[PDB]
Write a protein that binds this DNA or RNA. Structure first.
Ligand SMILES: [Mg+2]
Ligand SMILES: [Mg+2]
Lengths: 514, 390, 109, 110
DNA sequence: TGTACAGTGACAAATTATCTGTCGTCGGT
DNA sequence: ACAACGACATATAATTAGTCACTGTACATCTACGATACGTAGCGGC
DNA sequence: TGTACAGTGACTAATTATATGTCGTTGT
DNA sequence: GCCGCTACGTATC
């Protein structure tokens, strides 16, 4: 084991004592000790015994023997031990759970106990503040602790299962999460809508952003599936994005690492994982998600805080003009956000390295050039209805709609896996199991509405209105209920319901991409 | 105007110059004074001309003439005006409306213009911070400005009409406003309800709390009518409140001064005022009525922050246990809050005065003891249907 | 303070030209025989620059000495200490603790 | 930093008994001929007190001198400066500023 | 002239571990 | 012959612009919305 | 060993208003 | 054509 003490900058009295010690450092003759000790007593204006004591402290200890020594009672209160423990316990107990008691309130409890004990001289307010001083101080360091982070090139990710998985190359481990964007948006007229949701997908080996989905829709496994589709497929943008670089990323993960939200623990994402072959894993804590969490802070600082309609990070920062100053449509915010991610964010230097651009680290990081996946082969992203049973005459029933198709009647009594798109359920793909291998059977079409379209949400909402009204349900009556609601909304003086208008602007951006 | 300047913290070099000047205070003779200069040139390691300059700087300025004055460039920027105006106005435009542009983002706009103009020395980010520094301190100072206060027995409450009400005596001007309390309450089964609303009625002359209403109910002209009758009628509380002094406070205002809420600018309150004979007035800003707004902070600080289920003054300070740690019902919270107002708050020192309690100042401040109004004549609190036909 | 006010010996002083310095620190000089007019300085690099005279407000016309302003302040502090709530306040703070505990035992069961 | 870590010359140092001092300030002493190990001292009223040793992590085994670590640091700075806030990274800033500015629709009536 | 309470520098009074003499005692020359 | 002041040349620290290592703090679903009032327009019954 | 960017002390290079000499000139 | 009860627009805490 080891120990040492070193003097800090000497005080002026300690400097003088240093000159006296140097005056007493040379001699070898008892006569010269006596001479220089007596002149040192005169120089310090002290007794001869005092100079002897000074030399002895510098002999048995360092320069810290000729600096002053602090008192033994420094940092001990002179009030009784009962009172110091009473003040300490009263403060701590006053803060259990939701309660928040101030030192002044503690002082009132001190005075109340003093009346019970008939103590004419209890600790006053300043003494209570001093007694609680270190208790309040420690707290202020514990809240501020910095984490070292990772040093680079070697990285692993802690899962909620307690397992640590390494990250070895680009597209080894993707991560994803959603946020509100801190910007208010307007419709194509200039009336306010909502703050949109931004979903990002990001590669853990390179920190390069793989894809995004920006829209008014609340988070869902459908939103995660749209974001995976954009991440995975090769990307191209028209001149209206004004890009100078290309996003240039594509291909599919080996693992997908997420929060514990229902969106990512949904059966829909699990079916996407099993078809594309990328097992999912849940993060242990939000602090393990640093690679996906931090980019939202970076976007707030570099992008969103400069745009009209900025709402601040939270209500306490909200500019009073945030609703007076909203101007961007969703299509215009996406033009800005994609220019920023392609020309700026993915072109910045990767932290934890300093040598490499984030994209260059993705591209050089690849084990091999990934083979592009044809867009039609992302029909793996369709939801599966785990079974339906082929009724007599080849019918299937699904969400109240009745479907028939080109071969189904030969399979009556079997169970088939319907695979469907929630954006348009008027046609469904039917798959069956043969030799424990799922195979394609046919496309099934909702009888009598093959020329229409219906999202699953329209069919579900119209079905509730039919059940509430007490009317029967069939393909024609369900279709009539849907087109009648859109006609009734068209009679409204605003033609607005929040979702109908947010969907109109979102769909207008979605179908302007081509 | 007068124009004086005084030196401070003189000594560090200057004591050596001061001792030189002390040795030179008198032109003793043309023969001897020159010798004193040539001797002082041993204490300062400098020529006769440096000592003659020191003596002239002393005689024309006094003690500051010993101290080295700061350079004429101090606080000026060498980058040139173009860049100093470009940086200042870029910041200001980028923090217009809802935009909140940072100095780093301003530096990016500096590099962007310098690239357009083919400049080679666009100011560095460290110098951008320095150029924007003065206009950030101003913003921080302009938020921090303190205001003094009414001092002594004289008080003139400003209305939105620009007229000031001179508050002369107890019950001359009551004031009212509403706040959420910061505690989640539970039902009699222990399940979460909501945070109550508190209404107070304060007399401006005494700052005594003349009545309250506490409930889950919404601000309404009904809640204001209930706060008024509780303020006006004599008050009675049972022993389950454990009160040790009496809320002996009652009687009718001459004026009622309020915020712009629809409870107060309403036909119902106007019909209450016309029948009680008091005039309603509108508070010009939320800072003219500190007499009503500060009691609400005192209650957070003296009462509610020390109760279970406390929610903080805002969402960023919300104790995370508030929804799990709620215990009190509305009947407990009223039994605590009424005690606090009768035993503590109305019995504490009126802060403008320092030598009266709020209640003592109210009671002594009545121009006369008012006669209690029969509870039946508080029917005026009834709403009126104006014009229905038989 | 806003409007060019300073607080000295519990009196309030209004500066003649001081309102441009609201929120700034200043330092000030006074003759103890008559504190009714006070002299205010900006502190600066090694030097104090005279900024304005400032005048006391709300006081009587007769000139006010420093010791007299202390006298008014200690007499007023003695009244506040005399009038203070005391035992009645301690009783509230105890009974407020009790009620919380009986509810406390029922912490959602 | 948490777990008893310190940053010096861009290397990360882990202290042997240091972990209880997270969020505290410490001072530190080293021999420029070899900065693989650093001596950590607590600060007090007239004295520094020796607290514990700390060792560099993630580096090569060969003993690291101070001048050599400065060199490693300027090689990183030089490499980063080759991506010289390079023009793509700024060209966006005008167009972001000019999709805005152009859209003055906040209060446009007829 | 918002307002009024919790917290905070600047200073005075009570207490104490510590510095200084003075003399006595022990050891070295 | 001695003292004071300036014209001019010369060396000098004060101030600012720039560099770089160390570090504090937000990313972590989240205020547009609920609750009154007045003011005006409308549906069928009379 | 979370994360990565805006803001910040400690130090250094560039610019400059300013103190220091040396001598000439004027007044005494 | 006239009149008590509902319903929508606007403002403020
Ligand atoms: Mg999430
Ligand atoms: Mg109000």
């Amino acid at each position: 084991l080891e120990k040492n003490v070193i003097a800090t900058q000497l005080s002026e009295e300690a400097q003088v004592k240093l000159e006296v010690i140097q005056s007493l450092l040379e001699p070898c003759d008892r006569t010269t000790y006596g001479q220089k000790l007596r002149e040192a007593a005169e120089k310090l204006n002290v007794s001869l015994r005092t100079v002897q004591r000074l030399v002895k402290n510098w002999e048995q200890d360092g320069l810290v023997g000729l600096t002053q020594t602090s008192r033994a009672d420094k940092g001990k209160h002179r009030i009784g031990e009962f009172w110091e423990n009473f003040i300490t316990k009263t403060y701590k107990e006053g803060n259990k759970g939701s309660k928040r008691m101030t030192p002044k309130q503690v002082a009132l409890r001190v005075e109340a106990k003093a009346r019970e004990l008939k103590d004419s001289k209890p600790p006053n307010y300043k003494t209570v503040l001093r007694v609680l001083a270190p208790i309040l101080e420690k707290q202020q360091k514990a809240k501020s602790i910095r984490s070292p982070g990772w040093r680079g090139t070697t990285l692993s990710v802690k899962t909620r299962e307690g397992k640590d998985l390494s990250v070895d190359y680009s597209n080894h481990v993707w991560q994803c999460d959603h946020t509100r964007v801190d910007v208010l948006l307007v419709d194509q007229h200039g009336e306010i809508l909502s703050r949109p949701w931004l979903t990002t997908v990001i590669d853990t080996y390179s920190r390069c952003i793989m894809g995004i989905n920006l829209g008014f829709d609340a988070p869902s496994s459908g939103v995660v599936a749209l974001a995976l589709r954009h991440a995975i497929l090769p990307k191209r943008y028209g001149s209206e994005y004004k890009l100078h670089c290309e996003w240039g990323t594509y291909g599919k993960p080996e693992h997908f690492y997420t929060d514990g939200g229902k969106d990512f623990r949904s059966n829909h994402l699990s079916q996407i994982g099993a078809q594309l072959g990328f097992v999912c894993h849940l993060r242990d804590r939000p602090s393990e998600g640093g690679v996906v969490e931090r980019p939202f802070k970076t976007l707030n600082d570099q992008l969103f805080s400069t745009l009209p309609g900025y709402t601040g990070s939270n209500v306490q920062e909200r500019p009073e003009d945030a609703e007076k100053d909203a101007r961007l449509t969703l299509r215009e915010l996406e033009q800005l956000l994609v220019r920023y991610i392609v020309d700026r964010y993915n072109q910045s230097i990767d932290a934890r390295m300093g040598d490499q651009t984030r994209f260059e680290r993705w591209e050089a990081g690849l084990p091999t050039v990934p083979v592009p996946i044809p867009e039609r082969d992302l029909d793996i992203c369709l939801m599966k209805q785990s079974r339906r049973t082929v009724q007599r005459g080849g019918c299937l029933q699904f969400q109240n709609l009745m479907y028939r198709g080109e071969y189904l009647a030969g399979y009556a009594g079997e169970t088939v896996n319907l695979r469907f798109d929630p954006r348009d359920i008027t046609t469904i793909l039917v798959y069956r199991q043969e030799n424990n291998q799922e195979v394609f059977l046919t496309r099934a079409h909702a009888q009598g509405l093959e020329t229409e379209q219906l999202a699953l949400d329209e069919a579900e909402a119209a079905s509730r209105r039919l059940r509430t009204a007490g009317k029967t349900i069939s393909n024609q009556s369900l279709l009539q209920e849907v087109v009648d609601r859109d006609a009734l909304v068209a009679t409204k003086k605003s033609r607005k319901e929040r979702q109908k208008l947010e969907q109109t602007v979102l769909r207008s951006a979605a179908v302007d991409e081509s």
